[PDB]
């Protein structure tokens, strides 16, 4: 059960490295906006782990309750960590990472749990273009 | 042989719950595998089906957690019986769940319909079990499943835009249209 | 002998209660520790159980067993399925009762079998009766709506409990008929 709850960590350290490296002036005006609105989701992730700690302090949380509690943010991180691999993998910058955000938003057209996150990353990353 | 308060029927009773569990694991697996962003074998519509299935699996998981931690041994099974069959049925509805029933090997690996065929396979199964208690589960899967086609329809309806990846949508377009002439306009068509 | 019986009645056999397909449930009939007097009572109690197992097997056999794959009214049909959906819900109180007995045994560590006989003895009569309703269906290969009548003729039963019990099933089955008539009309 620890292993099944461990993928949200590999999708947290990989997600954070992309927000440091692709914030430099060299990567271009849009790659900066994509990571600057991806850093806001990391602040909210930290806000969740602080609430879970208070429940743990009162002896009122267990590994079966934690497993159900983190499921919503296991998905948000998974969409942010895959998208970051791709924007980095193709060395995309400028508009090559404003098309990759339009197309991924279509990929999930029925989900609405992940569609709102992507549709948001494109409103934020297309402000400079 | 030797056991701490375990007459065989307890093991047999434990075996029946187990059947339910095996399905959960396999099913949780069948839906869990996400699209991966490159599901060529399955269609856009197959990726919609799985998403919906998980929503059910999540609701199924929540009921298991809700169970009073304190309850009688026999009472726990009698409580979950309705659900236990409900899921095994859900399992068989999909080939995977049907597969590894336990009465057979994993070799059959029955092919699952995909594209329009899947949407239809479901509708027919809808009419077959319409009066049965298991029918509401299907209506739900279908409603969500049908969403992609509607968008396709809207895109090729209010708009004339022709858009597809795996060509699961029945209408088809060719390069004869790019000839842009009356004879080749007819030569370009749609599937039957 | 106590928790063991509830396990057997609940529908899972044990060595003391030997399931034989021909004999349903059957006691070994020979234990120097238990005198013959309690044996007969157990056999009597076993009868309710013999029927519980057969019913579940049948319900399991024709209900949800397949995703609608020579299917015919005896073999299958929306109506045949409806009979099964009802059979289990009519048998529900028997489940609740068995569950309740355990709570009392948890409550007290020494309750006679006779106490069991008394609480379960209202079912001792309803179960044999429901058996013929199904037995007629299988032998005559009753097909489709003809099942709706087969119960209705047994709706004139001289036991008030049985009448109420079967009536519930017809209400369930009518639902489908009302459902199919809901379209052609």
Element (H, E) at A65: helix A63-69
Tally C-beta pairs within 8 A across B and C.
62
CB-based contact A68 B35, cutoff 8 Å: no
Element (H, E) at C19: strand C17-20
Q: How far is CA B56 from the centre of its chain?
A: 10
Q: How many other β-carbons are positioned within 10 Å of the β-carbon of residue C80?
A: 21
Per-window interface: A 1-60 vs B, CB < 8 A: none
Mutate to test the interface with C, among B74, B99, B128 (most CBs of C within 10 A): B74
The tokens describing B49, both together, are 């089906």
The tokens describing B79, both together, are 């409580």
Residues B48, B113 contacting (CB under 8 angstroms): no
| Residues with Cβ within 8 Å of residue C59, at least 6 apart in sequence | C84, C87, C88
Query: Which one-letter DSSP state was computed for residue A27?
Result: G
What separation in angstroms does the CA of C120 have from each of A74, C9, C22? 51, 11, 24
Q: What share of chain C is helix, strand, coil (3-state, %, to 5)?
A: 70, 5, 25
Tokens 């430099």 locate to: A24
Q: Which chains touch C (3 or more CB pairs under 8 A)?
A: B
The tokens describing C131, both together, are 């058996």
B58: closest chain A residue by CA: A68
Q: Does B109 touch chain C (CB under 8 A)?
A: no
Query: What experiment produced this structure?
Result: cryo-EM
C103: closest chain B residue by CA: B72
CA distance B120 to B126: 9
Question: By three-state DSSP, how is residue C25 classified?
Answer: strand
Chain C residues inside the 8 Å CB shell of B101: none
Resolution (Å) of this entry: 4.1
Query: Pick from B90, B102, B80: which is nearest to B19 by CA?
Result: B102
CA distance C10 to B122: 36
Element (H, E) at A129: none
CA distance A115 to A112: 5
C56: closest chain B residue by CA: B81
In degrees and rounded to multiples of 5, residue C170 shows phi and psi of -60, -40
| Residues with Cβ within 8 Å of residue B129, at least 6 apart in sequence | B135, B138, C67, C68
Query: Pick from B55, B6, A78: which is nearest to C12 by CA?
Result: B6
Query: Pick from C82, C69, C87: which is nearest to C144 by CA?
Result: C82
User: What 3 state SS string does B134-170 have?
Assistant: CHHHHHHHHHHHHHHHHHHHHHCCCCCCCCCCCCCCC
| C14 DSSP β-pair partners | C17
Residues A79, A117 contacting (CB under 8 angstroms): yes
Q: How far is CA B67 from the centre of its chain?
A: 26
In degrees and rounded to multiples of 5, residue B45 shows phi and psi of -65, -35
Strands (E), chain B: none
State the virtual CA torsion across B19, B24, B26, B29 in degrees, nearest 10: -170
Number of C-alpha atoms within 13 angstroms, CB side, residue C181? Answer: 7
Per-window interface: C 46-105 vs B, CB < 8 A: 63-64, 66-68, 78, 81-82, 85, 95, 98-99, 102-103
């Amino acid at each position: 059960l620890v292993h099944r709850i461990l993928p949200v960590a590999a999708s947290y350290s990989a997600v954070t490295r992309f927000i440091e490296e692709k914030s430099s002036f060299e990567y271009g005006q849009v790659n900066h906006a994509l990571a600057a609105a991806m850093r806001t989701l990391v602040k909210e992730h930290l806000i969740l782990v602080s609430q879970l700690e208070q429940l743990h302090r009162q002896g009122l949380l267990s590994l079966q309750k934690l497993w159900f509690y983190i499921q919503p943010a296991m998905r948000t991180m998974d969409i942010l960590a895959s998208l970051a691999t791709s924007v980095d993998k193709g060395e995309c910058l400028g508009g090559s990472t404003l098309s990759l955000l339009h197309d991924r938003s279509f990929s999930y057209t029925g989900d609405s749990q992940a569609q709102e996150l992507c549709l948001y990353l494109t409103k934020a990353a297309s402000a400079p273009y | 042989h030797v056991s701490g308060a375990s007459p065989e029927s307890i093991s047999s009773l434990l075996s029946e719950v187990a059947e339910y569990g095996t399905c959960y694991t396999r099913l949780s697996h069948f839906s869990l595998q996400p699209v991966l962003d490159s599901l060529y074998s399955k269609g856009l519509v197959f990726q919609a089906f799985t998403s919906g299935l998980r929503r059910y699996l999540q609701y199924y998981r929540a009921c298991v957690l809700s169970t009073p931690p304190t309850l009688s041994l026999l009472t726990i099974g009698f409580l979950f019986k309705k659900l236990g069959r409900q899921l095994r049925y859900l399992a068989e509805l999909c080939g995977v769940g049907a597969v590894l029933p336990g009465t057979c090997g994993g070799g059959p690996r029955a092919a699952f319909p995909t594209g329009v065929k899947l949407l239809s396979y479901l509708y027919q199964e809808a009419l077959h079990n319409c009066s049965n208690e298991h029918y509401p589960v299907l209506l739900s899967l279908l409603k969500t499943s049908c969403e992609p086609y509607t968008r396709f329809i809207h895109d090729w309806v209010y708009s004339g835009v022709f858009r597809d990846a795996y060509g699961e949508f029945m209408i088809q377009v060719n390069h004869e249209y790019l000839s842009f002439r009356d004879k080749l306009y007819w030569t370009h068509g749609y599937v039957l | 002998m106590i928790h063991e019986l509830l396990l057997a009645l609940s529908g899972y056999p044990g060595s003391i209660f030997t399931w034989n397909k021909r004999s349903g449930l059957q006691v070994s009939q020979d234990f120097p520790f238990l005198h013959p007097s309690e044996t007969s009572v157990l056999n009597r109690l076993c009868r309710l159980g013999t029927d519980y197992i057969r019913f579940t097997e049948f319900i399991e056999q024709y209900t949800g067993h397949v995703q609608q794959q020579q299917g015919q009214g005896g073999l299958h049909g929306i109506y045949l399925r409806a009979f099964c959906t009802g059979l289990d819900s009519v048998l529900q109180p028997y489940r609740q009762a068995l569950l309740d007995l355990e709570q009392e045994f948890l409550g007290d560590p020494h309750l006679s079998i006779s106490h069991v006989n008394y609480f379960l003895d209202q079912f001792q009569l309803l179960f044999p009766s429901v058996m013929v309703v199904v037995e007629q269906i299988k032998s005559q290969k009753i097909h489709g709506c003809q099942i709706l009548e087969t119960v209705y003729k047994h709706s004139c039963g001289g036991l008030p409990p049985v009448r109420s019990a079967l009536e519930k099933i017809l209400a369930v089955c009518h639902g489908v008929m009302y459902k199919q008539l809901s379209a052609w009309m």
